[PDB]
Amino acid sequence: NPLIAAASVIAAGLAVGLASIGPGVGQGTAAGQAVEGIARQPEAEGKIRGTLLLSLAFMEALTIYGLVVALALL
Amino acid sequence: NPLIAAASVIAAGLAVGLASIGPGVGQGTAAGQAVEGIARQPEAEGKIRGTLLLSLAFMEALTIYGLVVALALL
Amino acid sequence: NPLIAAASVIAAGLAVGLASIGPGVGQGTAAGQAVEGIARQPEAEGKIRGTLLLSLAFMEALTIYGLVVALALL
Amino acid sequence: NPLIAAASVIAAGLAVGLASIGPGVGQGTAAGQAVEGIARQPEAEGKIRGTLLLSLAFMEALTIYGLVVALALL
Amino acid sequence: NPLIAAASVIAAGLAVGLASIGPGVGQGTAAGQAVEGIARQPEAEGKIRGTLLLSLAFMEALTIYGLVVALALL
Amino acid sequence: NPLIAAASVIAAGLAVGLASIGPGVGQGTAAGQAVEGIARQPEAEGKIRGTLLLSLAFMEALTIYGLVVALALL
Amino acid sequence: NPLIAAASVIAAGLAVGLASIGPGVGQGTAAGQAVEGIARQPEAEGKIRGTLLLSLAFMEALTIYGLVVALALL
Amino acid sequence: NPLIAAASVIAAGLAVGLASIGPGVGQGTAAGQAVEGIARQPEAEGKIRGTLLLSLAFMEALTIYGLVVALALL
Amino acid sequence: NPLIAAASVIAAGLAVGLASIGPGVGQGTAAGQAVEGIARQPEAEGKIRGTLLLSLAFMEALTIYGLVVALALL
Amino acid sequence: NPLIAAASVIAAGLAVGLASIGPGVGQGTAAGQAVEGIARQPEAEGKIRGTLLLSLAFMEALTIYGLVVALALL
Amino acid sequence: NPLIAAASVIAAGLAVGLASIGPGVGQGTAAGQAVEGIARQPEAEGKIRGTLLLSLAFMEALTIYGLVVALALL
Amino acid sequence: NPLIAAASVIAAGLAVGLASIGPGVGQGTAAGQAVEGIARQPEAEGKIRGTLLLSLAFMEALTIYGLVVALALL
Amino acid sequence: NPLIAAASVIAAGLAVGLASIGPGVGQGTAAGQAVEGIARQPEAEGKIRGTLLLSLAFMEALTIYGLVVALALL
Amino acid sequence: NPLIAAASVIAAGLAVGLASIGPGVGQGTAAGQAVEGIARQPEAEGKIRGTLLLSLAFMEALTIYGLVVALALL
């Protein structure tokens, strides 16, 4: 019975890796696009990693939130 | 029973390798776009750098958060 | 019986990994576009931020709706 | 027999987890492209938010309709 | 016999989840494109919100259409 | 034997859900882009949307044409 | 024996549900691009649009041509 | 044995109905881009349309070519 | 024995369908792009159509080459 | 026995159908690009259509080359 | 046993057909773009042929490299 | 039993090799776009190459982070 | 036992056929983008070409890495 | 048992040949964007190709690093 449950955890764990790529793929976009605003204006200079990047950073936390559910099975 | 649990753990492993892909994606996207933004205005950076730092962290964060869950099972 | 239930939990876990990639996409997009929008002028994220939540919400809504089904199996 | 039925519900459920990824993408797109349109808009804007709900709704509608099927499999 | 039937319903149920992926994408696309169109012209503008519903509908439609077949199995 | 045949019809049904993915994409696109075109200038009224329906129809048509063959198997 | 042969036909039907995706694709493309062209030019509407019928047709044509193949076994 | 062979031909048939979807998306894109080019000038119609048929044909062609293989099994 | 060989030829056949997808795209591409080029003006034609056949041919060529191998299995 | 051998040939055919997808993408690209280049300058052709064949050839070539290995099994 | 091993070689052979399609992609890109670049004529005269081969080669190289693996089994 | 578990960890390992290919593509994007951005702009713009490493690194980082988890099972 | 070991080698081979995809697509990108750069400035530029060897290498590197495992089975 | 383990190692090797796919993509991108940047400035020379190598190397590096893991299973 533990054999089956164990495979369940072991997979549950894998499939947090599948999530992880949708991942930061989004995270890159923000950052890039945010650095761009800064160059145009001094107020602009830095703002998107700033603050738009931050949402991407939050997404990474969510992905960890995944890595959470992954071990939470174990 | 161990044979099953083992495969579980085997899979749980493979799929933390997928996470990495997709994560590696978004990251790449930020960087490209930031290299461009930075090219335009040299002085403006600093706010931009801070934003990049915010984006870059959050991403690396949720990536470990997985790797964490990965061993947290074991 | 437990064999079946176990496979259910295992998949349930995995398929919360699918949810994220679609969500992890759109998030980065908003953020990127918002660092930029703001860059040009002061008063940024004003009436605009108003529609930002609107859609930031609708997105998290359907991503939750999944996360819902995910825990609803548990 | 309950084993089979159970798997049926399980699967009927997991297929709210595909819906969201496709839905989560398109939602993110609207938002991104609207953040831009708004940045241009001044006096005109807010008749706009009117169509925004319209579609923001339609989307959340079919995403719930899934989350519904998800818990209904329960 | 119930085992086979149960799988049939379970699958029939899954495949409302697929419907939602594709619909959920497109909805966002309409809305985005409409937020923009309206920004461009004031005189034409707000006539457009009319189109926004049109497409916001079409998207919520196909997502339901899936949820419809989903519960229709139950 | 009916158990097998039933699973056949069940799967056959699911794969009409795939068909809808692809069509469902393009429809949303037309609409979005037409909302914008319609906004910019008035020109002659009720000339453009006219073709939009035309194609919006043809697309939803073939998706039914399937749903038809789906229930026709029943 | 007939149970098997039947499922064959069943499936053969269902994978003509694959067609529908790919077709539904190009169709939406034509339409979108034409809605735009007409917006620029009054002439395309009520004339340019008519050709679109040429295409709106050819598209709905090959969608039956499939539903044809679907029953063309039975 | 004929039961199995039969199912093989039945699937082979209907999975030449999947072929159509990939072709259909490609065919539409041509048509769109032509409805537009034509909108600019009178010459494309009766000239540019010349291509329109070309591809409108090629598209409906490969859809039959399948329906052909479909009934070429029955 | 023919039953098995037949199923082999059947599958071999199907996978000419895959080939056809990719070839069928590229042909459609040449054409689409040429309809556009031509739209630009009437006088030029007769240096260009020349390479168009060249490539239109090469594309159709490799699509047959497959259909050839497809029946060659039979 | 033959069942095996048959499948061998079946596969050998089939995965020479994957080849076509990729191939068909690039061939179409050359051709498009030429139909466009030509649209620009009428006289210039005759330096051009020269490389058009070059690649129109190399494209048909590899498509066949595949169809080659496909029938070469038979 | 030889029946199984033979099918292994058979498939291995096929999947030199998968490779050609992927290569066929990038090769087509070069060619198209060169068709065009030359027409612009900045590198159009004296340069268009030269890189064309370079890439036409690299592409047919990796498609052969497969065909090589294909016969390397025999 | 160990024989089977071993083959599991073996395949699991391999599929971490898949992940890596995607990571390299992403890192390449940043770098390219930076080499270009730097070519065009005012002043030395040395910072640019500095960000290039930044992301070239982050990419190769998560690629090993996988290969790490791969051998970490071992 | 030899049966399994044999299949190992058969697979180990094939998946060095995947390599070919990714390189072939990847090398094509560099070349395409350089064919353009070159078109612009004859005496000027060519910095990219130096870069290409950089990249021409990296590509041939991982493609070799496969070719290695390919001949290593020999 | 060695039979299975052997097959495992054999595949484990191969699927580090998939890696190459993705990688090859990104490498090409770095290079393409740098060939452009360098074209722009003679000032954009002699340091510009310096980074080209830098990345061309890093790319080839990780491609081996795979081919390493490939033979490391051996």
Report the C-alpha gap between M45 and E11 in whole angstroms: 59
Q: Determination method here?
A: X-ray
- Judge contact between D62 and E64, C-beta under 8 A: yes
Q: Which residues from M are below 8 Å from J26, CB to CB?
A: 28
Strands (DSSP E) found in chain E: none
Per the CB < 8 Å rule, is F26 touching H21?
A: no
Residue B14: helix, strand or coil by DSSP? Answer: helix
Which of I27, I17, I30 is closest to I61 using CA atoms? I27
To the nearest 10 degrees (0 to 180), the angle between helices C47-73 and C2-40 is: 170
DSSP A8-62: HHHHHHHHHHHHHHHHHHHHHHHHHHHHHHHHH-TTTTTTTIIIIIHHHHHHHHH
Report the C-alpha gap between M22 and B36 in whole angstroms: 26
- Judge contact between G16 and H17, C-beta under 8 A: yes
Report the C-alpha gap between M26 and I39 in whole angstroms: 34
Report the C-alpha gap between F70 and G6 in whole angstroms: 15
Report the C-alpha gap between N7 and N11 in whole angstroms: 6
Report the C-alpha gap between E73 and I63 in whole angstroms: 42
Which of M48, M11, M45, M3 is closest to M30 using CA atoms? M48
Environment class of residue H74 by beta-carbon count within 10 Å: exposed (0-12), middle (13-18) or buried (19+)?
middle
- Neighbouring CB atoms inside 10 A of D74's CB total 11
Residue matched to tokens 């071999």: I12
Q: Does L14 touch chain M (CB under 8 A)?
A: yes
Chosen for mutation from B58, B60, B71, B74 (greatest number of chain A CBs closer than 10 Å) is B58
- Judge contact between C14 and B18, C-beta under 8 A: no
Per the CB < 8 Å rule, is M28 touching K59?
A: yes
- Residue in chain J closest to I68 (alpha carbons) equals J67
To the nearest 10 degrees (0 to 180), the angle between helices M18-40 and N21-40 is: 10
Q: Does L35 touch chain M (CB under 8 A)?
A: yes
Residues L4, L5, L7: CA angle, nearest 5 degrees: 65
- Judge contact between H20 and F22, C-beta under 8 A: no
Report the C-alpha gap between L5 and C1 in whole angstroms: 24
Separation in Å, CA of L63 to nearest CA in chain N: 8
- Judge contact between H7 and I10, C-beta under 8 A: no
Environment class of residue B21 by beta-carbon count within 10 Å: exposed (0-12), middle (13-18) or buried (19+)?
buried
- Neighbouring CB atoms inside 10 A of D64's CB total 22
Structure tokens at H17: 């109905």
To the nearest 10 degrees (0 to 180), the angle between helices G49-73 and H2-14 is: 180
- Residue in chain E closest to F48 (alpha carbons) equals E51
Chosen for mutation from I62, I63, I68, I71 (greatest number of chain J CBs closer than 10 Å) is I62
Structure tokens at D29: 């797109």
Structure tokens at D67: 């989350």
Structure tokens at E13: 């149920």
Q: Length of chain E, please?
A: 74
- Judge contact between C67 and C19, C-beta under 8 A: yes
Per the CB < 8 Å rule, is H29 touching I34?
A: no
- Judge contact between I74 and J73, C-beta under 8 A: no
Q: Which residues from D are below 8 Å from E69, CB to CB?
A: none
Environment class of residue C66 by beta-carbon count within 10 Å: exposed (0-12), middle (13-18) or buried (19+)?
buried
Q: Does E66 touch chain F (CB under 8 A)?
A: yes
Which of N19, N28, N58, N63 is closest to L58 using CA atoms? N58
Residue B40: helix, strand or coil by DSSP? Answer: helix
Report the C-alpha gap between A44 and A51 in whole angstroms: 12
Looking at chain D, which subunits does it touch, using at least 3 CB pairs closer than 8 Å as the criterion?
Answer: C, E
- Judge contact between J18 and K70, C-beta under 8 A: no
Q: Which residues from E are below 8 Å from D67, CB to CB?
A: none
Report the C-alpha gap between J17 and M36 in whole angstroms: 32
In this structure, what is the dihedral angle of CA atoms M15, M18, M19, M21, given to the nearest 10 degrees?
A: 170
Residues 6+ apart with CB under 8 A from J26: I26, J59, K23, K24, K25, K26, K27, K28, K29, K30, K31, K32, K59, M28
Candidate from I3, I17, I32 with C-beta closest to H19: I17
The superfamily in CATH containing domain C1-74 is: F1F0 ATP synthase subunit C (1.20.20.10)
- Neighbouring CB atoms inside 10 A of C60's CB total 17
Q: Does N21 touch chain L (CB under 8 A)?
A: yes
Give, rounded to a whole angstrom, the gap between the first and last alpha carbons of chain C. Answer: 15
Residue F10: helix, strand or coil by DSSP? Answer: helix
Report the C-alpha gap between K52 and J50 in whole angstroms: 12
- Judge contact between M54 and N55, C-beta under 8 A: yes
DSSP state at residue C43: T
Report the C-alpha gap between B54 and B65 in whole angstroms: 17
DSSP state at residue A44: T
Report the C-alpha gap between D25 and D32 in whole angstroms: 11
Query: How many Å separate Cα M26 from the centre of its chain?
Result: 7
CA distances for D15 relative to A10, B12, D37, D67, E19, angstroms: 22, 22, 34, 9, 9
- Judge contact between C10 and A11, C-beta under 8 A: yes
Q: Does B63 touch chain C (CB under 8 A)?
A: no
Residue matched to tokens 């595909």: D18
**C/D touch flag: 3 or more CB pairs below 8 Å:** yes
Q: Does K24 touch chain I (CB under 8 A)?
A: yes
**C/M touch flag: 3 or more CB pairs below 8 Å:** no
Residues B49, B55, B59: CA angle, nearest 5 degrees: 140
Separation in Å, CA of L37 to nearest CA in chain B: 5
Entry resolution in angstroms?
Answer: 6.0
